[PDB]
Amino acid sequence: IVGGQEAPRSKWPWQVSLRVHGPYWMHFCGGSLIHPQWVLTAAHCVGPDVKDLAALRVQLREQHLYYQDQLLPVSRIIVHPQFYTAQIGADIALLELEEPVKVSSHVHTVTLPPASETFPPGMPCWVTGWGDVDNDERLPPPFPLKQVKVPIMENHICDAKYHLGAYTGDDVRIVRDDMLCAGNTRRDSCQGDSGGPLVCKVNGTWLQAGVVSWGEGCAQPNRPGIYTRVTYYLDWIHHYVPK
Amino acid sequence: IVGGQEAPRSKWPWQVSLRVHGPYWMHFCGGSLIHPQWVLTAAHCVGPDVKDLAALRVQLREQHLYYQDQLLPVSRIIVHPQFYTAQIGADIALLELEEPVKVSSHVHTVTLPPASETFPPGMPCWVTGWGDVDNDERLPPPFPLKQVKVPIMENHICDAKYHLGAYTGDDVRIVRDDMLCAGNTRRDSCQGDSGGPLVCKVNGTWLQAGVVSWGEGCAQPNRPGIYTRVTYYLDWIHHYVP
Amino acid sequence: IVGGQEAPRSKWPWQVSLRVHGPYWMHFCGGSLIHPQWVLTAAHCVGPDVKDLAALRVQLREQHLYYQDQLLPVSRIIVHPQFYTAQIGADIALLELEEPVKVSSHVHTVTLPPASETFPPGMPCWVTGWGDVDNDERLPPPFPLKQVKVPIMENHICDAKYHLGAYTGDDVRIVRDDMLCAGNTRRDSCQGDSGGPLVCKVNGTWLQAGVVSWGEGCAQPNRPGIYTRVTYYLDWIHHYVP
Amino acid sequence: IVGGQEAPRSKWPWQVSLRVHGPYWMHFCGGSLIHPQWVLTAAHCVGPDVKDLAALRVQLREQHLYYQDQLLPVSRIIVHPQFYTAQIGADIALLELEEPVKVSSHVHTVTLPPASETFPPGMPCWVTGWGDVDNDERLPPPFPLKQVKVPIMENHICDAKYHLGAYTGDDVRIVRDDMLCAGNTRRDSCQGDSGGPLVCKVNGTWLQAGVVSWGEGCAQPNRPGIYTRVTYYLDWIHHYVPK
Numbered sequence: 001i002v003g004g005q006e007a008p009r010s011k012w013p014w015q016v017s018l019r020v021h022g023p024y025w026m027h028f029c030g031g032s033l034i035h036p037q038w039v040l041t042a043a044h045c046v047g048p049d050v051k052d053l054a055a056l057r058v059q060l061r062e063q064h065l066y067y068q069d070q071l072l073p074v075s076r077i078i079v080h081p082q083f084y085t086a087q088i089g090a091d092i093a094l095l096e097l098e099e100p101v102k103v104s105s106h107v108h109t110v111t112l113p114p115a116s117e118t119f120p121p122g123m124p125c126w127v128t129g130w131g132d133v134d135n136d137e138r139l140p141p142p143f144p145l146k147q148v149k150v151p152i153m154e155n156h157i158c159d160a161k162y163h164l165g166a167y168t169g170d171d172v173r174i175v176r177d178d179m180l181c182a183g184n185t186r187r188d189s190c191q192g193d194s195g196g197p198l199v200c201k202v203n204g205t206w207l208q209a210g211v212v213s214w215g216e217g218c219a220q221p222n223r224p225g226i227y228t229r230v231t232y233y234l235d236w237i238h239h240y241v242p243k
Numbered sequence: 244i245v246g247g248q249e250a251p252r253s254k255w256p257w258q259v260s261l262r263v264h265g266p267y268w269m270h271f272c273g274g275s276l277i278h279p280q281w282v283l284t285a286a287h288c289v290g291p292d293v294k295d296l297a298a299l300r301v302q303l304r305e306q307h308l309y310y311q312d313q314l315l316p317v318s319r320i321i322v323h324p325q326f327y328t329a330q331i332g333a334d335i336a337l338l339e340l341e342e343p344v345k346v347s348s349h350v351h352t353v354t355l356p357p358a359s360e361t362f363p364p365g366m367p368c369w370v371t372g373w374g375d376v377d378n379d380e381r382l383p384p385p386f387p388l389k390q391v392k393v394p395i396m397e398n399h400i401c402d403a404k405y406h407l408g409a410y411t412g413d414d415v416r417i418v419r420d421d422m423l424c425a426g427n428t429r430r431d432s433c434q435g436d437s438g439g440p441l442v443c444k445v446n447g448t449w450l451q452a453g454v455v456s457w458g459e460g461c462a463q464p465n466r467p468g469i470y471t472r473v474t475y476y477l478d479w480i481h482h483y484v485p
Numbered sequence: 486i487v488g489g490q491e492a493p494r495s496k497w498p499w500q501v502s503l504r505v506h507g508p509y510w511m512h513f514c515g516g517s518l519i520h521p522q523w524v525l526t527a528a529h530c531v532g533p534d535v536k537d538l539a540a541l542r543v544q545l546r547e548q549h550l551y552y553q554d555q556l557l558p559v560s561r562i563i564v565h566p567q568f569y570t571a572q573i574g575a576d577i578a579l580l581e582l583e584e585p586v587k588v589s590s591h592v593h594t595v596t597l598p599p600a601s602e603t604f605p606p607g608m609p610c611w612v613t614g615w616g617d618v619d620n621d622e623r624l625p626p627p628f629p630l631k632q633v634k635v636p637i638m639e640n641h642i643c644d645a646k647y648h649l650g651a652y653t654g655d656d657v658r659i660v661r662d663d664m665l666c667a668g669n670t671r672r673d674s675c676q677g678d679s680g681g682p683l684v685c686k687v688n689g690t691w692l693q694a695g696v697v698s699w700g701e702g703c704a705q706p707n708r709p710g711i712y713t714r715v716t717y718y719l720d721w722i723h724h725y726v727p
Numbered sequence: 728i729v730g731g732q733e734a735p736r737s738k739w740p741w742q743v744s745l746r747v748h749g750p751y752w753m754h755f756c757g758g759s760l761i762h763p764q765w766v767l768t769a770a771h772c773v774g775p776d777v778k779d780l781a782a783l784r785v786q787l788r789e790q791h792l793y794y795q796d797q798l799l800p801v802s803r804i805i806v807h808p809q810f811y812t813a814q815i816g817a818d819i820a821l822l823e824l825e826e827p828v829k830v831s832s833h834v835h836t837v838t839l840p841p842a843s844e845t846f847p848p849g850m851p852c853w854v855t856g857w858g859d860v861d862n863d864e865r866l867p868p869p870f871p872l873k874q875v876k877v878p879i880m881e882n883h884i885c886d887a888k889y890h891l892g893a894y895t896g897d898d899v900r901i902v903r904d905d906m907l908c909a910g911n912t913r914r915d916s917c918q919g920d921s922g923g924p925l926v927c928k929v930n931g932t933w934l935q936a937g938v939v940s941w942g943e944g945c946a947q948p949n950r951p952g953i954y955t956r957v958t959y960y961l962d963w964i965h966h967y968v969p970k
């Protein structure tokens with residue numbers, strides 16, 4: 001997270017950390033708890049190449065990475081089959097947990113938006129994670145969970161912005177219709193936040209609009225953060241995850 | 244270049260080296276001389292983002308990098324407008340030099356294929372460059388130009404390989420129709436070779452079948468090297484190059 | 486710390502962590518509380534070159550680095566005037582804190598040895614720290630304080646080991662009389678542990694026999710860990726610490 | 728070499744490059760040809776730990792490293808036995824070549840000074856090598872041999888300078904009597920030059936005053952380059968190398 005600050009302990013009960021087996025269980029991506037037994041994340045965190053399940057675990061909402069871990073095994077990785085790279089899209093995946101978590105005030109699911117939901121431009125949304133605090137700048141120990149408010153932007157503007165300073169034909173799409181953008185040169189998601197949630201409070205209730213997917217660096221001019229658009233993939237999500 | 248060997252001095256007179264300004268004018272991509280005033284390379288060497296022309300030079304065929312540089316400034320960078328990333332395609336670009344070079348036995352242009360040539364499996368093809376000699380393994384000084392003969396694989400076969408060990412749906416195409424596959428686990432191009440030429444000998448003439456573009460690593464199982472298919476982009480090249 | 490294990494919370498209440506200002510206040514050396522206002526450490530952690538005091542803080546005993554820091558500024562750095570490098574000796578220094586700390590069961594001072602104590606082979610001794618767990622192998626988060634029991638080796642035996650596989654003349658002393666050796670190929674201190682304490686239990690009291698100083702790597706054949714011998718430097722410590 | 732420039736092809740015929748076996752025969756130290764069959768270099772380049780002879784070769788005077796190598800095997804490494812670290816001193820070693828080289832205008836020995844020779848302060852001497860051109864700044868390809876003029880300084884001043892900005896007692900020696908200093912904040916030897924020659928022209932003839940040994944960085948304030956003082960070790964050198 002660039003330009004944000006440490007989250008209050010009561011906030012973002014759905015945030016999770018995906019961990020890879022090594023000399024320690026290292027954080028490499030975020031995710032969100034969307035059902036007691038399901039984690040939503042970005043496909044690029046776990047593909048397109050097939051990876052070993054035993055070398056992956058999930059950590060639910062932690063204020064500081066690694067201090068008090070209770071790692072949860074994963075029973076299935078479901079990567080969207082249209083996924084090959086973030087820039088082509090379908091950057092979305094599900095992790096089925098081996099047990100349903102017992103939900104609490106501190107740890108609980110985020111609500112997915114209705115298919116019709118549209119998140120208008122300018123809407124103050126929030127993204128959260130434990131990724132880099134700027135380009136090639138790691139989150140320092142003790143690794144607080146961070147949060148930052150980012151405005152939604154219309155795809156047409158986000159796409160037009162990606163073309164400024166680029167050779168790509170202005171009529172050749174860069175930001176695709178299953179993506180969603182947010183952020184500016186002060187507030188952005190960054191490396192290690194991927195997979196985690198962009199959430200917007202609508203009618204006083206938090207909806208997951210986006211899954212952190214990619215961008216050109218972090219908080220660079222004319223290069224907002226790009227997210228997988230959750231509404232786009234509801235039917236695929238609901239193919240596996242109970243309403 | 245993975246596998247293969249140092250090129251003889253008389254071979255590949257069209258090979259060039261692209262250099263970026265820094266503590267020294269460092270090699271970062273290949274290219275090929277296709278006209279006295281034009282270099283063909285990969286878009287991803289020079290975009291998608293617009294860069295300062297003054298920080299880019301071209302070196303014509305040299306047997307060892309850096310030892311006898313005579314660097315040439317560029318007047319224009321022309322990047323295929325459909326290009327955004329190499330995994331999508333249109334990984335192709337043209338550099339116009341400030342001056343026409345003088346050609347000779349040692350330095351001269353490569354011939355572009357006719358539009359109908361498909362370069363099928365079993366064609367004798369070579370890729371050349373000063374790139375890595377394996378995954379994360381730099382070419383050692385004195386940086387000789389390397390070559391390796393690489394076997395062409397049909398696109399459909401190459402696409403199906405790229406699906407082994409992947410989540411990607413089989414009907415979701417990875418290797419596109421504007422790409423070409425060549426190489427195996429002993430013979431491939433690698434980082435640093437991008438933008439340079441894959442050339443095949445057809446009726447005694449060397450034709451540039453491809454431009455080194457991408458792959459999943461270098462010389463890995465089921466992941467042949469991927470090239471931009473030059474025939475696909477002839478009309479675009481000919482909007483600029485006589 | 487190579488070998489060994491995470492320290493229990495009730496052990497080593499004198500352990501401290503030295504921090505350098507940067508993107509975060511990073512741990513770079515150990516130390517030991519020897520008085521409420523004084524930390525004992527290795528010179529090479531803080532010299533030979535004079536550094537800005539404002540860029541240095543001390544953290545008192547903490548079970549995990551960084552998680553609950555309450556950092557303490559330093560008023561003075563006092564470096565043994567004979568110190569230049571750790572291989573020569575006098576690798577010892579004192580930090581005076583701006584305020585006296587408050588002591589307790591969890592945080593309190595270590596006892597310095599009487600001048601006559603020599604710490605012979607077979608004494609039970611432990612070294613503690615948040616340093617590397619092997620050569621070029623960082624302590625992983627969450628950075629627990631580690632301990633390991635290390636066997637003392639007589640200086641003369643340690644010196645002769647340091648000569649095996651070396652050109653250095655046998656009569657040319659490597660391990661000096663103001664140093665102490667402990668450890669083997671399974672149990673040692675390592676980078677990051679420097680300045681912290683080697684403590685041995687004598688008549689029921691923990692005595693600080695050494696300050697972690699140097700070695701040829703960590704836990705390598707014939708290269709035990711080398712420590713500054715605290716008894717040698719008592720008079721100097723007592724010029725400053727009550 | 729810091730602050731210098733590429734040497735003329737005719738100069739420094741005695742300079743050599745020591746090479747270590749790896750993915751290529753990489754330069755790690757300089758040396759000087761002091762007899763047809765002997766190379767003088769710094770002990771720290773080859774010790775104090777005993778190293779494998781087969782993984783070491785010598786390259787005589789090359790204008791550019793690696794372009795035209797003709798590597799020479801070494802038959803013996805002789806490290807001064809009083810050597811353990813550069814800061815304690817005796818940082819001096821000999822390499823005996825397996826063959827005497829056939830000497831030419833382009834490649835030939837440097838003359839060692841007489842035991843009595845004293846190189847007065849202020850004397851313009853030269854150091855040469857293929858080391859870093861500043862602190863943590865590698866010599867770029869194509870690796871020209873560089874040269875720089877550095878003045879000799881008296882040990883007492885070099886030692887006094889090392890004490891400025893240091894905790895070390897002013898009466899506790901840093902620069903020892905078998906060492907020699909030269910250079911300033913514009914002109915210095917640096918990493919990878921170690922082992923190579925500091926040469927001074929006396930009575931119109933080149934004498935090797937120094938062997939590049941150590942220092943605190945390169946060309947830093949109050950921290951001149953320290954050299955092993957060749958006159959100090961003549962009798963040891965002549966114990967092995969014919970007059």
Ligand SMILES: C[Si](C)(O[Si](C)(C)c1cccc2sc(C(=O)N3CCC(c4cccc(CN)c4)CC3)cc12)c1cccc2sc(C(=O)N3CCC(c4cccc(CN)c4)CC3)cc12
Pocket residue numbers: 085087188189190191192193194212213214215216217218219224225226328330431432433434435436437455456457458459460461462467468469
């Ligand atoms: C790792 Si990759 C080179 O692409 Si990028 C992820 C650097 C990339 C591609 C296109 C646009 C952007 S934009 C961007 C970026 O700036 N990032 C990543 C996203 C990140 C981020 C993260 C979260 C949130 C935000 C929003 N602020 C931003 C910020 C930094 C990275 C990118 C890559 C992608 C997909 C498939 C492959 S396969 C592959 C690969 O294995 N190689 C590269 C090709 C190479 C090769 C060269 C020549 C010849 C051959 C044939 N043998 C092979 C071998 C090695 C690399 C890739």
Ligand SMILES: C[Si](C)(O[Si](C)(C)c1cccc2sc(C(=O)N3CCC(c4cccc(CN)c4)CC3)cc12)c1cccc2sc(C(=O)N3CCC(c4cccc(CN)c4)CC3)cc12
Pocket residue numbers: 570572673674675676677678679697698699700701702703704709710711812814915916917918919920921939940941942943944945946951952953
């Ligand atoms: C950085 Si240094 C060469 O010492 Si070392 C740490 C590599 C070292 C010297 C001698 C023996 C050992 S043994 C060892 C080691 O293996 N370590 C460090 C200790 C560590 C450790 C730590 C704690 C506990 C243990 C016990 N298990 C072990 C394990 C790893 C390191 C060493 C050094 C020491 C003292 C003064 C200086 S000044 C200096 C310096 O600035 N440079 C080196 C010289 C160089 C130079 C070259 C040519 C010409 C010039 C003139 N311009 C300058 C410039 C850069 C470096 C040093």
Ligand SMILES: [Cl-]
Pocket residue numbers: 153154155156
């Ligand atoms: Cl929209």
Ligand SMILES: [Cl-]
Pocket residue numbers: 247248390391392
């Ligand atoms: Cl071949």
Ligand SMILES: [Cl-]
Pocket residue numbers: 489490632633634
């Ligand atoms: Cl133990």
Ligand SMILES: [Cl-]
Pocket residue numbers: 880881882883
């Ligand atoms: Cl003198």
